[PDB]
Every structure is written in C-alpha cells, then in structure tokens.
Amino acid sequence: SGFRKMAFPSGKVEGCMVQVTCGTTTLNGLWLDDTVYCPRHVICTAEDMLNPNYEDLLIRKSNHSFLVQAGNVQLRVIGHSMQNCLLRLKVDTSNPKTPKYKFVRIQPGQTFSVLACYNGSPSGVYQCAMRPNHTIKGSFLNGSCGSVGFNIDYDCVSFCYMHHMELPTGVHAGTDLEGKFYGPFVDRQTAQAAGTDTTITLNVLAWLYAAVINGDRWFLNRFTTTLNDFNLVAMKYNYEPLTQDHVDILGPLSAQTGIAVLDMCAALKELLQNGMNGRTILGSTILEDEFTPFDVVRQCSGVTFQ
Amino acid sequence: SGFRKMAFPSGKVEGCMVQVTCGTTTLNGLWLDDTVYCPRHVICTAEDMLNPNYEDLLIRKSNHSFLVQAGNVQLRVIGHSMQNCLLRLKVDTSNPKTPKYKFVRIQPGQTFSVLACYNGSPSGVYQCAMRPNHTIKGSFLNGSCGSVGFNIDYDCVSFCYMHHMELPTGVHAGTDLEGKFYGPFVDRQTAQAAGTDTTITLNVLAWLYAAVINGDRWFLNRFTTTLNDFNLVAMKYNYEPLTQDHVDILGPLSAQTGIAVLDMCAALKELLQNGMNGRTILGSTILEDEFTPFDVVRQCSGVTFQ
C-alpha cells in the first residue's frame, strides 16, 4: 500500500556523470562509451549568451580547449563535434560503467527521473513530468546544466532529457539526447517564456484508477458521460481534451478495477464541478497529473483492494 | 529554482542489495563487507507469524538453511546470529561494492531516502519522513521487506531504516540497522495499529523559509508571537509544540531571510487560522511537513530571491 512519486534507482546513471569545463564555464556531461555529451552553451561566456553563433564560437576551439573530469581522473578529448544543441567530445577512454542505454525523445505528459548534478557529482533524484507546454518543473540551481532525465526498462537506461536552462517563471527547459529542444526554446538569452500549460487529463484519470486499486471509491458516481460532453467540461477547467486513444490506453486499468473509462470520466467531471469537499485522494487534496497509466501499473498492486 | 521532494542518489545502496531465502519466504537483505542484514521474520512460515518464538525457530536452522543471492551469484552462509529483530548472516565473500557507511537511529521528524526493492532488485527511490508516531508513509508491496532507508553525507551512507511490516492503515513500520523497532511495534501478527499522529511543526516552518528563499512572501504578516501563544494554536490544530531548541535550529534560515522565527510563527498561526485562500506555497495548496531545516538548506539557493 501507499502511493508516492517514485524515481528510478539512479546508480546506472551516476556512473556516467562527468564535469566539462571550457574556459571559465563548468557544467555536467554524460559519458557513454568514448563520448561525453553536454550542452553546447559550455563554449559561451557572459555576453556570447546574448547573441551566440555556435558555429563561429566552436571553430575557434581545439580538442584541448575542453577539460573533462571523471571523479579524480582527467579524460583526454581527442575529437569534438556539435549535434544540434549538444557538444560531443570523443575521449581517449571508453566508460567502463556504461549501461545498456537508448536515446529516446519523450512525449508531453510522459514522466522521467532526473538526476540533479553539480560539478559532475550527483546530488539528488526526483520524478518529473514533461508538461504539455514542453517545460518541466524541476529543482535546479546554477551549475545543474547537463543533468539528465531518464527511465529504466529492465537493465536499459532510456535517456530522454538534458538540462539547458531556467525560464522566467522558474520552470526548466532542455533537449533530448540528440540536442533537439523540447518546445520552442533556444540556447540563448532572450525574452522566451513558457507558453500557457494545461492539466494532463490522461494522468489524472490514471491516478484515480490507482486510488480505486488502493481501496478508495468515494469519488465514484452512478453517472456516465460521452467523450464530447466530458471535453466541454475539460476546456472550462483547462484540462487536455480526452481522446479515444487515451480511453484505449486506460483499458488495462479499467479492467483491473471494473470501472469503465467513461464512468471514471463522469467521476472526474463531478470532482471538477463540485471540488473535493475537504477530502483527499491518495493523501492529496488536489487532482494529481504527474503519474502516467504506466507509473500506476508500475507502482500499484496487480490486485485491487475491493 | 523549484522545490521537489528529493531523494539521495541510490547507486551506493543498490550495490548492497541481496535476496535472502529461508524455506519458502524470500525478502531483501543488506550486504556490507561479509555480513548480510535482513528481517528475522524471514525464518517464519504462515502461522509462526501469529505467535513466533524466534529463539526457538532459529536454533532449528543451520547455515545452509539460508540462501543468499547477489545478482546471479550465490553467497555461502558461514555463520548466523540474531540481533534484536534482525538476522545477521556471515557470508564467505566480502561485498566489493561496500561504501563507507554508518548505522544511525533517526529521530521523529527526520527524513531519509527509501530504496524500494523486490527479490533483491531495486525498483524505486523516494523520500520519506519518520512520523511523530514512528511510522512512515511509504509505498511498499509484498516482497519489499528488508528494503532500506538512508541518508548520504559526502561519500558515507548513513543507514537508518529496514522495512519489516505494513500496519492496518497502510502505513509502514520497521527497525534501525541494529534491529530495534521504531515505535512500539513488534515483528508478529497482532492487533497493533499506528498511534495518532501530529504535524511536524519544525518542518512546516522550515518549508515556509524555503518559500521565502525562493521568492514568495505573501503569507507573512506584521505580527509576532510568543512561544507559549503559538503553542496554544498548535494544539488546537494538532501540530507539535514548538520548543526553544526548534527556534534555535531555525537560526541559519532565519538569518538568510531576515525573518525572525517568532515572526514566521505568527505567519504560520495566521495560515492555520485563516486557511490559504485559494493560494499555493511552493506549488502546494497545503502546509508540507516532510522537509527538515537540513533538507531546505541542502536544496535551496544560499542566496534568497529578495
């Protein structure tokens, strides 16, 4: 029993974290095999960042412009290229702690674990959702750039995020592990702000199923809804429209609990319209949207508390 | 910026997790040097658990009654003893992944990271507070016993918790790493229930300081309070009494923000009396009590958003 935001165990990722220094900027890099991945803005000074030309700034660097430290070991750079918003530094040593890994580009609403690092040393681990507006609400201080996001699938690390910036509202932006930003953001100092966000409907529904699985049924009702009628309420409350694909995804959870998706949608519609009446769901006084249907299946018992 | 429940990176602990089997029960053990620590109730069947005599059940076992698996390696038991509610199995191999570690007995209100494990394989990591009533609100399923709690201090793992049971309300109980239970709980099937709990005042106050450090001042007021007058409100709202020791502990945070502890207590007293008025603090609609003053200093910037 119980239900907590749970991160993946971070060990496999810890063994890949390094420090990258160029001139006067230090941040974190990812060391897999003989390559270290890091944000390209490591080559920028305080003024370059205002209107940088990375092609022009980079041609001016050599292999020995880059200092890479794995623990108390210095790694020799023997090659370098830029891949979108990432630098790739080929190093003379292949990482003996390299896990089986993939690079994946995560979709909005999906979750991942973040290993927050400073100076190449892991300091903390927490679970995040990629928001509909392509930001994450992380916890990052100066020197956290190059910290990675990931999921773990058996023994395989699926890297999905590298941290690049904080936006005006204190939320975070970054790239996948090919250097392509999530969202319309760029790696330079601009007026860029997070677009407006919405609540991840599918995740709220997933989390209501988790509450039932864990033994709580108080929020259910005798009603049902059509997709279209639910979606009218959803837009009034700044929830994402529910789609038939989302209904399909909730299938396994629907079957485990014996509650039809659209019946659960009527429950949600009622919760949205009537509030929660001083009551809690899975210990929470609000409707939580940072657990996927997958996170619920991962964490909950396969058998429900009927 | 941002503020999240953050666990310690779990790698150092992952390398110590094993599977322990006795007869038909499997659970997790902790492998440090040449010793594997696990709950003693691993020797109990489904009926022993109702009125077990562990001294009597244990004398009936040999070294080869115990099967220990580290990954795909079997470890040979060459000794065994009971220490309070723990078994200690001496093994023929010393763990090469043993970190610098200590065993510590944590106090109520203190936090720690939990590495949830099943069959000796880490599955998740999350942050927990030891409640005033000596339980934790973890997330554990069957086979999670022997999963450990810990803090990390530089390179040193301070182990503080080993998981033994779930109580009637779905909250969790266990021991320190000497086998002494937190709380009045025992390792047998009884009517035992969690005593009534209270909110950890010192932690709520710590978290209000974090909110100010992160830039938010809306909940402050022009008032101050005496300890004694705050404590009258505290008992009406089932908060722990504030003590002068707790005021002293909040010193560093008080100095960083320029807000006197007792002035912050007046703010809290007002929040308790008036509610929060549809507003949020650090993204939360409720007063959070699972961050210590230490957790706030660890996570927040040393410089406040004035």
Side-chain angles (χ1 to χ4, degrees), chain A residues 1-4 299, chain B residues 114 126-128 135-140 166 170-172:
Chain A
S1 183
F3 200 80
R4 280 202 104 115
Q299 188 174 349
Chain B
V114 172
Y126 56 89
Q127 192 79 346
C128 258
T135 69
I136 64 169
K137 296 184 197 158
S139 169
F140 286 114
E166 181 168 297
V171 300
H172 304 102

Side-chain angles (χ1 to χ4, degrees), chain A residues 1-12 14 115-116 122-129 136-141 166 169-172 283 285-286 290 298-302, chain B residues 1-12 14 115-116 122-129 136-141 166 169-172 283 285-286 290 298-302:
Chain A
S1 183
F3 200 80
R4 280 202 104 115
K5 250 137 198 200
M6 283 207 335
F8 288 100
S10 66
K12 285 174 176 68
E14 292 165 57
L115 185 65
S123 58
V125 62
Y126 56 89
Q127 192 79 346
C128 258
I136 64 169
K137 296 184 197 158
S139 169
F140 286 114
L141 304 167
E166 181 168 297
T169 54
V171 300
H172 304 102
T285 55
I286 57 145
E290 301 210 351
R298 154 155 100 111
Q299 188 174 349
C300 288
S301 168
Chain B
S1 183
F3 200 80
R4 280 202 104 115
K5 250 137 198 200
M6 283 207 335
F8 288 100
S10 66
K12 285 174 176 68
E14 292 165 57
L115 185 65
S123 58
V125 62
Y126 56 89
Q127 192 79 346
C128 258
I136 64 169
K137 296 184 197 158
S139 169
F140 286 114
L141 304 167
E166 181 168 297
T169 54
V171 300
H172 304 102
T285 55
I286 57 145
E290 301 210 351
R298 154 155 100 111
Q299 188 174 349
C300 288
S301 168

